[PDB]
Amino acid sequence: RWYERRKRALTLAALPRERYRAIFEPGCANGELSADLAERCDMLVCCDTSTQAVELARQRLADVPHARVVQARLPHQWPAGQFDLIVFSELYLDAADLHRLIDCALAALSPDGQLLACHWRPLNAQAVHAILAERLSMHRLFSHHEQDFLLDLWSR
């Protein structure tokens, strides 16, 4: 598990700011990252379609009273809120779907919001990050692309 452990150590260290008001992830499946983000913000929220991931996140995130877990039928159906950090980690299914997430991301970002993107690579992870690069029109502050995974931070 060394590799997975390093990808997380690297992900959390990639963040410029020590703490964040509101963090949000369009996914609850990445359970240990969520744990670790929790200790870096005043408010964590994760939203997922799958009811299994939601139920799990609900447990993993019990002794963490400032986290909140939401379920939605559609991936472009986000909760209310304005977030200064949005995190993208689980490879959706083609360019249009991804554009819609970025759209929701753009609406919800605080005037100084950052966006963190991190994917293993088995549309692939390389196109995911290229599409991000091209659509967000934000400064790329951090960037590490290796054979196993890609990692990027955008800011304003």
Domain that holds residue 125: 1-156
HSE-up of residue 54 (Cα within 13 Å, Cβ side) = 11
Q: Quote the number of domains for the chain.
A: 1
Resolution value (Å, 1 decimal): 2.8
Locus of tokens 């559609």: 74
* CATH number of the domain that residue 138 is part of: 3.40.50.150
What whole-number distance in Å separates Cα of residue 7 and Cα of residue 150?
9
User: Under 8 Å CB-to-CB from 117, ≥6 apart: which residues?
Assistant: 87, 88, 89, 128, 129, 132, 150, 151, 152, 153, 154
